[PDB]
Amino acid sequence: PNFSGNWKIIRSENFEELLKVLGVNVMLRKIAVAAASKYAVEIKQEGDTFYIKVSTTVYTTEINFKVGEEFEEQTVDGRPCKSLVKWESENKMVCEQKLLKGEGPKTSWTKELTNDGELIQTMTADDVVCTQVFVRE
Numbered sequence: 016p017n018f019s020g021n022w023k024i025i026r027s028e029n030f031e032e033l034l035k036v037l038g039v040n041v042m043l044r045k046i047a048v049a050a051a052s053k054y055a056v057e058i059k060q061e062g063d064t065f066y067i068k069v070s071t072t073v074y075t076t077e078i079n080f081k082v083g084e085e086f087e088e089q090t091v092d093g094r095p096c097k098s099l100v101k102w103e104s105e106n107k108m109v110c111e112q113k114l115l116k117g118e119g120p121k122t123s124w125t126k127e128l129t130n131d132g133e134l135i136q137t138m139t140a141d142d143v144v145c146t147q148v149f150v151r152e
């Protein structure tokens with residue numbers, strides 16, 4: 016697998032409904048959906064070590080992990096969590112998250128490299144799955 020690259024979003028589905036389950040009110044949900052249209056992912060993969068930079072027009076954040084090793088990041092609605100990534104297949108990984116403080120919906124994400132050169136990311140809160148599709152810049 017070579018997830019490394021500069022990825023630009025081409026399609027984003029069910030993001031508003033994800034934010035709804037996480038308790039974001041409607042006006043901010045719409046504003047967030049609009050930001051998701053301009054959002055980019057930079058990945059550097061070496062073996063099973065990943066550096067991921069997620070950026071929008073005004074915000075950037077870095078995620079660093081090695082597959083199978085616990086790390087700390089934040090949920091989609093911004094709460095800190097402990098995360099653990101495992102492979103599901105040659106080109107798909109899955110992340111399970113656990114809140115450090117409090118309760119909330121069960122969240123997770125996945126990344127997949129398709130045979131067509133697309134990157135598919137999903138983010139889940141309970142029953143609702145957001146699917147986002149990227150191509151290399």
Ligand SMILES: *C/C=C(C)/C=C/C=C(C)/C=C/C1=C(C)CCCC1(C)C
Pocket residue numbers: 047048050051054067069070071078090091092124125126136
């Ligand atoms: C492997 C990829 C990961 C962990 C990507 C995570 C992406 C996000 C947490 C994106 C969040 C967004 C917002 C909370 C507001 C709207 C724009 C997004 C999609 C960048």
